[PDB]
């Protein structure tokens, strides 16, 4: 039984993490924070995610609930996450970090603290996408040399960056497995007279529409046949499920910097 | 009896056009060109498509065979097609144009010449795509105002123009049905920080891979749901049989700009 | 002001219908049922969807709340729906029916009752599917005689009936537009040595997996090409908003069998 | 130099095998069969595939040409393939089997004869499908326990067996990687009231349409996400080149049951 503290439990990710920890039978929702000024401080965590009463409340500082949790799941903001890390060090807790947008200096501090603390830190927690990165590697080794490699992704209308960071992550897994640098081979746009396709290029096609949570397809195309590997994200919940999966696994692990690769056992397939 | 000249008879399309005209008894394979630089000049057209001798040869200039043909079928390159148009004007011939990748100025020239010459011009000669144009119009009247409209197309690695003339044809059908001009709303590339999607934009995504004969998808995406209309082309014969069908039909006709909509009687769908 | 009773309010649809009626300003959530043996009987309707308190409870029989509602919205199970229909007849109420999986005998009954009662019945309450039924008709007239017609649908793991009522709806639209009866041509299972496909058959393929809200594809396949018309449902709110929109529209109306085509004004597309 | 007999050389596969053996410089087209009642009996094999005369004819019985060949390539029908296996046993020949749709009893016979005869048997001779079998094993270990697993396949209108042997091959790879037997968990048809999906079932959906060379998708579906691994076959030459490559490889080998996984050296991927 793993006792989970959800940092910023009112956030978009937070609320999903609470719901996800609730649904995992090996995990217990034990604690939850929000910003001190927030009025959700005091509210029961189950009522927050629309799922009945848990007998736990949102606190304004996880420090205050240290003794009731084993592992912190933290998808908040850089400064907050660094304070939660420091708590782990001090009180012998573990942390699953989902927060992004750290400075280089701050990323260096995490690496240091991860020598004393069990830390999971990943740029994506989807079980399916990480499984897909591995499968792409296998496919690239077998077919990459002689196939045309295309990456196509669809997202909702509000997404401001193209292509997706997950698409770029698929490119890198492929390029790396083939001993290449993605920036050497990547083609992001095709407009007008492009000429004949190059042999080594990895082409990116980007769709922006509706409320699409996230679709990714990597295509390996040969004359005569093609292999398509596709991930569909249906619910921002899936990331939360993965992060909880990671917290369970991280429980009673030694100190170290761990990734989803490690959690899912991708290296030993 | 309709006497057909196949422009660039050695091309991917050209060879299929020859074979298609051969299979239609209302049509006679009468003439065939290639680039002057080519050594195929003097070779027999039937031997070229692997179907026995025809007693017709590939000339380097269709000008030299003007009395042997009624209609030119032209799936080559923009400059070549413009020359063949000029021949039609001067010698009272007809043309079926399949070539894509024209500049707007060049499309304006074709509109002009089509006042004097019977011209069939379509970005796609397949029944299914032309049906699809009509369906897109319906979908656009119902959903187009409040949906995000995305066009995605995949072709084989040798295609030199992006996006496909068929994709542009889908955009025009949709825009026109909504009382808009495609050029106002179209977005052909999405790279880096694009910002939030605009409401009226039609996005184009272009895949180049393998031996793909042709895939098109038009997407109407609302929050909560989407409608996808997809065409898949399996065989270049689909295009070639259509283009020959169009040539036979064009023989009877007066000057004008015609489409496969016209040929197939699909206008009042 | 239209007073809505939501049948089976605890269900996947029921809860979304409650939320949808709540958000529609012309409609009021007035009543709600669940199965008699259920312990949700007595709970406040707003609390079930985490919507706050409504001052309305889940009854075990809509008969008990008859004076509080004008229209029943019913997405439950066949026998339950027939009982609610009976209520409508006896007390001069209207019904919007979403339930699928009725026997032919039962559908004949609904047609009979709909002579005395205002009834909306559709297999799908989304705009996109109802648009799609119209597009299918067009596609069937043009391609249906040459093409092989296949209908493939995916739904979540809990759906109890196959194939979907929406798929059957697509089959009927197609068959009817081609002057056939669906039951003559439909093929619902393919196992073992089936032989060569017949020419007129409409094939049904059913996928059951995960949390899939609903995917439908009608395929028109010819040698050399195919046309695929696809609907993807992303959120049950698409259905629920439509069904509520249908209830509001039904309030004004006399006895009769209506469809979403009627509600949305799509009959003469 | 490996002397190849092509069984049923007139068939869709047979003709492509002839063409493929012709193009492979280590192999020679030595012999070829058709059904005795067939009028292609007597015709030269080269003329059949449209690439000139070979000085080899289509016999009505490979028994008659036994001294001219080392290996039989057999993509015909179950009874025919069993006779050719019997011929291999009697005269010390090898066989590459592509035929699908064997009964359980007949597959046991092939296993027995493969103790005395060098046999390659695979449901798909493509590189991409065999790679896919490996990728499915990976996905099945990571996601198979908690996901719904669905297999969907599309083929041309002439295919006589359902589901595809390749789909059954994907099921077995998945089941086997999860320590299960496919026959325990497979569900081939879903019609009417099926109830809620069981957890462990592998669902098979079969599409028969047009000229589809071959599409396969294996779906791993969890609540919130899914992973889709898809193979598309565009040209029968993919199969034929592989089968010939298998025949060349089989020439050196002793008695045994081999697969493409063996031929391609993919077992440790
Ligand atoms: N696939 C993924 O791995 C994935 C998916 C979504 C988001 N993210 C990451 O998660 C982070 C935030 O997620 P979001 O934008 O959906 O949620 P959000 O920004 O809406 O919520 C952030 C929450 O953190 C809380 N917070 C901030 N300071 C705090 C403090 N001192 N104490 C307690 N709580 C505090 C906020 O009050 C808020 O509730 C981002 O860095 C983002 O990069 C990752
Ligand atoms: N509208 C349609 O339905 C349709 C279908 C298929 C292809 N296309 C388009 O048609 C064009 C041809 O495509 P392809 O894939 O067959 O290309 P391809 O390059 O195989 O064929 C082009 C041929 O045209 C020839 N050519 C060029 N200039 C010439 C000249 N002056 N005289 C004679 N021949 C000349 C070339 O020598 C070559 O043989 C492309 O623009 C493509 O986009 C259109
Ligand atoms: N037309 C559409 O747009 C559409 C959309 C979704 C679902 N459906 C159909 O609607 C029906 C229900 O779907 P669901 O996924 O929401 O199922 P569900 O099981 O989640 O919900 C059905 C609810 O009805 C309740 N119920 C059963 N018997 C009852 C009774 N006698 N009195 C009161 N309540 C009772 C159940 O207890 C349950 O809460 C199905 O038949 C489905 O095929 C139609
Ligand atoms: N394993 C694979 O990679 C793969 C790939 C494609 C097709 N197939 C399978 O291979 C088989 C052949 O498919 P197809 O599309 O080529 O079928 P087809 O009907 O086109 O060809 C079968 C041929 O075998 C011939 N034949 C039948 N009985 C014979 C006999 N007793 N002696 C000699 N010839 C005989 C037929 O006359 C015919 O020409 C099918 O079972 C199909 O599922 C397997
Ligand atoms: O137009 C033809 O079909 C054509 C022209 C010439 C021949 C032939 O030699 O068979 O066929
Ligand atoms: O629509 C097109 O542009 C189109 C259709 C077909 C091709 C091609 O094969 O290059 O290009
Ligand atoms: O058309 C249907 O039957 C349909 C649409 C949605 C559902 C469901 O969720 O069960 O069923
Ligand atoms: O896996 C198969 O059964 C298979 C693969 C290809 C075909 C066919 O073309 O009939 O059948």
């Amino acid at each position: 039984m793993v006792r989970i503290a959800v940092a910023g439990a009112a956030g978009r990710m937070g609320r999903n993490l609470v719901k996800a920890a609730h649904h995992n039978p090996v995990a217990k929702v034990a604690a939850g924070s929000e910003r001190p000024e927030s009025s959700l401080v005091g509210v029961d965590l189950g009522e927050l995610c629309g799922e009945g009463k848990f007998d736990v409340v949102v606190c304004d500082d996880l420090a205050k609930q240290i003794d009731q949790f084993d592992v912190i799941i933290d998808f908040t903001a850089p400064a907050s996450t660094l304070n939660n890390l420091a708590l782990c060090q001090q009180y012998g807790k573990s942390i699953v970090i989902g927060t992004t947008g750290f400075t280089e200096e701050q990323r260096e501090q995490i690496d240091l603290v991860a020598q004393q603390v069990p830390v999971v830190m990943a740029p994506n927690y989807s079980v399916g996408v990480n499984l897909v990165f591995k499968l792409l590697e296998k496919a690239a080794k077998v077919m990459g040399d002689y196939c045309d490699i295309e990456i196509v992704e669809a997202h909702h209308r509000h997404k401001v960056d193209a292509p997706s960071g997950t698409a770029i992550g698929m490119g890198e897994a492929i390029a790396g497995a083939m001993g290449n640098k993605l920036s050497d081979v990547a083609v992001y746009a095709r407009e007008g007279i492009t000429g004949e396709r190059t042999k080594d290029e990895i082409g990116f096609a980007t769709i922006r529409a509706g409320d699409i949570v996230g679709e990714h397809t990597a295509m390996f195309a040969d004359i005569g046949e093609r292999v398509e590997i596709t991930h569909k994200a249906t619910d921002r919940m899936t990331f939360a499920n993965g992060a909880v999966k990671a917290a369970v696994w991280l429980h009673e692990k030694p100190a170290g910097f761990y990734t989803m690769t490690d959690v899912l056992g991708l290296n030993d397939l």
Side-chain angles (χ1 to χ4, degrees), chain A residues 1-11 13-36 38-52 54-103 105-106 109-111 113-180 182-198 200-267 269:
Chain A
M1 211 76 195
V2 190
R3 301 171 318 159
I4 289 165
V6 176
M13 275 310 293
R15 193 183 171 273
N16 282 285
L17 286 167
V18 172
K19 203 179 293 175
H22 182 57
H23 293 147
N24 197 320
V26 176
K28 177 194 74 187
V29 180
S33 58
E34 261 305 327
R35 36 175 279 271
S38 183
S39 63
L40 295 168
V41 178
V43 172
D44 180 280
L45 288 179
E47 299 193 6
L48 170 60
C49 70
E51 195 134 64
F54 288 173
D55 273 16
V56 185
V57 307
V58 175
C59 202
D60 60 0
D61 184 354
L62 282 174
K64 297 175 175 190
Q65 311 187 261
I66 287 271
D67 293 334
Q68 52 206 215
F69 71 80
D70 302 312
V71 65
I72 299 172
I73 305 179
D74 194 331
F75 282 72
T76 65
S80 161
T81 302
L82 290 169
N83 291 327
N84 286 335
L85 237 197
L87 287 191
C88 289
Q89 197 170 3
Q90 183 177 1
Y91 300 103
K93 310 298 174 176
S94 294
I95 189 161
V96 169
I97 301 173
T99 310
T100 67
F102 293 99
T103 65
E105 165 224 310
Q106 293 173 334
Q109 194 169 35
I110 296 164
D111 288 329
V113 177
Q115 297 170 5
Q116 316 230 354
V117 175
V119 180
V120 174
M121 187 170 182
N124 203 289
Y125 288 88
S126 175
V127 166
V129 174
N130 280 292
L131 160 65
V132 161
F133 289 151
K134 193 51 190 168
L135 294 181
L136 293 184
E137 290 171 356
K138 299 331 203 152
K141 298 248 183 154
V142 174
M143 295 180 77
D145 282 0
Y146 70 95
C147 285
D148 298 326
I149 301 175
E150 297 280 282
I151 295 169
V152 59
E153 59 98 347
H155 282 81
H156 65 84
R157 65 172 67 131
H158 311 294
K159 185 169 182 53
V160 305
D161 62 315
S164 71
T166 295
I168 291 159
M170 287 165 90
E172 279 164 8
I174 289 160
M178 293 173 63
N180 299 326
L182 182 61
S183 60
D184 293 330
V185 301
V187 176
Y188 294 113
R190 285 184 180 126
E191 179 173 2
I193 308 305
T194 59
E196 288 210 33
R197 195 192 189 283
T198 295
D200 294 325
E201 70 186 62
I202 306 181
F204 287 83
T206 293
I207 300 157
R208 296 297 175 245
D211 61 7
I212 294 164
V213 167
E215 278 175 33
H216 299 88
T217 288
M219 190 193 287
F220 298 82
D222 188 28
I223 60 102
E225 83 187 311
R226 57 183 137 113
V227 171
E228 283 176 25
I229 294 161
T230 291
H231 186 262
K232 280 161 191 169
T234 292
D235 197 321
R236 288 184 217 276
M237 170 224 204
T238 189
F239 309 98
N241 290 336
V244 167
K245 273 164 173 182
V248 167
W249 180 97
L250 193 54
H251 191 40
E252 280 170 357
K253 277 281 172 182
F257 189 100
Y258 307 92
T259 68
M260 273 299 284
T261 308
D262 300 328
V263 175
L264 295 168
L266 292 197
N267 280 304
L269 294 176

